[PDB]
Amino acid sequence: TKQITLYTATFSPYAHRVRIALEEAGAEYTTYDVDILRNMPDWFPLVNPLKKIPAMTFGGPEVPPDQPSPESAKIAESLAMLEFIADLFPDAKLLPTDPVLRARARTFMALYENYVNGQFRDVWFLGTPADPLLQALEMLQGALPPDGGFAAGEWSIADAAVIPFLARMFPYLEAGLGLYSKEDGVKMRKAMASERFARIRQYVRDCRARPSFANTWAGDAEQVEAAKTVPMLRVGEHHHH
Amino acid sequence: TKQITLYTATFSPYAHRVRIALEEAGAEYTTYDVDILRNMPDWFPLVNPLKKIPAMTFGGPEVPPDQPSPESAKIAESLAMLEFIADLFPDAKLLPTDPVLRARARTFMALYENYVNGQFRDVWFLGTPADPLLQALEMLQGALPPDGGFAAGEWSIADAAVIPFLARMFPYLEAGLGLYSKEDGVKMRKAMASERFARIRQYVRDCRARPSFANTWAGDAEQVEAAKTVPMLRVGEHHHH
Ligand SMILES: N[C@@H](CCC(=O)N[C@@H](CSC(=S)NCCc1ccccc1)C(=O)NCC(=O)O)C(=O)O
Ligand SMILES: N[C@@H](CCC(=O)N[C@@H](CSC(=S)NCCc1ccccc1)C(=O)NCC(=O)O)C(=O)O
Numbered sequence: 140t141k142q143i144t145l146y147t148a149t150f151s152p153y154a155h156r157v158r159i160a161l162e163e164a165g166a167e168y169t170t171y172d173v174d175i176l177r178n179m180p181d182w183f184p185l186v187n188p189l190k191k192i193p194a195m196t197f198g199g200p201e202v203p204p205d206q207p208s209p210e211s212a213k214i215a216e217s218l219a220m221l222e223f224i225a226d227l228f229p230d231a232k233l234l235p236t237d238p239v240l241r242a243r244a245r246t247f248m249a250l251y252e253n254y255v256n257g258q259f260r261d262v263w264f265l266g267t268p269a270d271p272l273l274q275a276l277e278m279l280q281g282a283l284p285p286d287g288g289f290a291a292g293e294w295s296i297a298d299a300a301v302i303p304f305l306a307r308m309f310p311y312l313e314a315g316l317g318l319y320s321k322e323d324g325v326k327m328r329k330a331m332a333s334e335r336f337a338r339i340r341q342y343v344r345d346c347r348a349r350p351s352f353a354n355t356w357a358g359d360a361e362q363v364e365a366a367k368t369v370p371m372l373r374v375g376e377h378h379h380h
Numbered sequence: 381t382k383q384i385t386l387y388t389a390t391f392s393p394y395a396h397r398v399r400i401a402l403e404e405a406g407a408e409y410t411t412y413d414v415d416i417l418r419n420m421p422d423w424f425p426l427v428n429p430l431k432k433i434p435a436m437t438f439g440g441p442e443v444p445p446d447q448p449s450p451e452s453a454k455i456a457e458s459l460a461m462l463e464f465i466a467d468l469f470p471d472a473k474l475l476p477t478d479p480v481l482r483a484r485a486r487t488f489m490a491l492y493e494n495y496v497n498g499q500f501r502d503v504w505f506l507g508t509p510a511d512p513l514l515q516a517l518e519m520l521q522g523a524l525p526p527d528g529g530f531a532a533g534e535w536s537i538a539d540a541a542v543i544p545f546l547a548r549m550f551p552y553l554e555a556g557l558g559l560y561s562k563e564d565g566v567k568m569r570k571a572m573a574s575e576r577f578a579r580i581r582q583y584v585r586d587c588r589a590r591p592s593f594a595n596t597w598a599g600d601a602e603q604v605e606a607a608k609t610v611p612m613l614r615v616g617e618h619h620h621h
């Protein structure tokens with residue numbers, strides 16, 4: 140198989156998505172953990188001109204990750220990477236075969252990206268109000284099959300897309316990480332433990348139980364420590380509405 | 381053989397995406413145009429509970445669009461619909477077969493969704509400064525093959541995803557529709573006419589020349605009039621500095 144190199148960082152939920160999918164695929168791959176606390180290496184724009192993590196190279200000669208080759212394909216954007224891995228490894232069935240079930244997976248990924256993800260970003264990094272995030276999570280939970288299972292029934296890349304963010308939410312809340320107020324932290328912790336969110340808590344447990352999560356997660360406390368190194372999580376800053 | 385119904389509106393670039401893809405697929409389908417100036421029908425949340433257009437039903441008995449059946453699948457989110465149409469009509473080759481070229485298509489869609497679409501929204505609906513939108517458009521332009529072609533080479537759903545927005549930009553600017561100032565309107569019109577943006581103009585021309593655009597566009601002047609009906613475009617209102 141043509142080589143896969145993923146440029147990643149422990150804190151990054153977008154990178155985590157692609158690590159999960161690569162584990163589920165059974166792929167051979169290399170990871171290279173960047174250090175955002177130091178100057179970005181001058182080679183990094185060769186693998187992602189937008190200066191984003193994850194970055195992915197595919198094919199080309201086998202080279203050290205810090206010496207990327209011009210011959211490798213440079214694949215940008217985590218959701219594009221998820222669909223790429225699903226295309227590369229059809230025997231791993233990272234999407235359903237049925238068109239309608241595949242659409243459920245794609246719909247779930249779009250619902251998350253369009254209505255939930257920006258709320259996580261704004262509540263955590265800007266300290267905007269928590270209620271719209273809780274409303275968007277309740278909407279997303281309503282898209283899950285009610286009786287159990289994953290977004291499209293069997294596990295798929297839709298679950299790789301979403302679990303990195305939901306799995307960080309619980310330990311980040313408990314550690315008090317984020318720019319939201321104390322009041323909104325209390326509200327979120329009570330809501331996420333309440334009966335209204337029992338289905339999404341089961342979904343999180345089901346996704347975390349898979350080896351693809353265990354093998355790509357540093358541990359709750361270690362992930363909290365990695366997130367504390369993120370400059371935009373301006374420590375000691377909180378916003379109040 | 382299963383029925384497709386698309387709930388649409390002329391002004392909506394998101395619905396336009398799916399009309400283009402259905403044309404390219406050679407699908408048999410029904411459209412039902414909603415009227416956002418009157419009360420939303422009580423049946424509409426049965427097809428989409430987020431109150432969004434487009435909405436799609438698939439399968440079930442043939443029924444009038446205003447009497448949707450519980451037996452049809454209810455598909456939400458325009459990009460999920462595009463991928464669904466590609467899956468349903470494999471002989472139409474609405475995505476490449478090669479995995480790397482497929483990833484170019486997905487990347488282009490993610491670049492537009494994540495970095496460009498929100499700039500269009502800020503500038504048109506809030507009147508924020510135009511420079512970040514021009515920067516994001518230059519980035520998107522840079523992702524196209526420079527010597528010609530569509531986003532992934534051959535035409536794909538990536539081009540159905542992006543042309544509705546780029547095609548509206550030119551006539552909207554010429555009509556002065558959107559919350560940006562005259563100064564930023566002049567700036568954008570000059571920029572989009574300059575050699576800096578020749579490649580994206582070629583892209584717009586190439587996408588517009590296909591029958592799938594012609595058969596799904598009401599004409600520039602008619603599309604402008606339809607957009608004037610949108611409340612959040614606040615016709616007559618402009619924000620300065
Ligand atoms: N749309 C993109 C988004 C990727 C992204 O935002 N990644 C990083 C942000 S980009 C980043 S960390 N780039 C680092 C560039 C760099 C490389 C090497 C050394 C130093 C810096 C992230 O996880 N932020 C945290 C959050 O939003 O919760 C995608 O889906 O891949
Ligand atoms: N993420 C969604 C976005 C869909 C969306 O925003 N659609 C409409 C907005 S939702 C809409 S128009 N809802 C109408 C609901 C309705 C149905 C029937 C009667 C009355 C109202 C739109 O085109 N807005 C214009 C723009 O953003 O440029 C998608 O990708 O499908």
Ligand SMILES: [Ca+2]
Nearest residue numbers: 280281282283
């Ligand atoms: Ca439901």
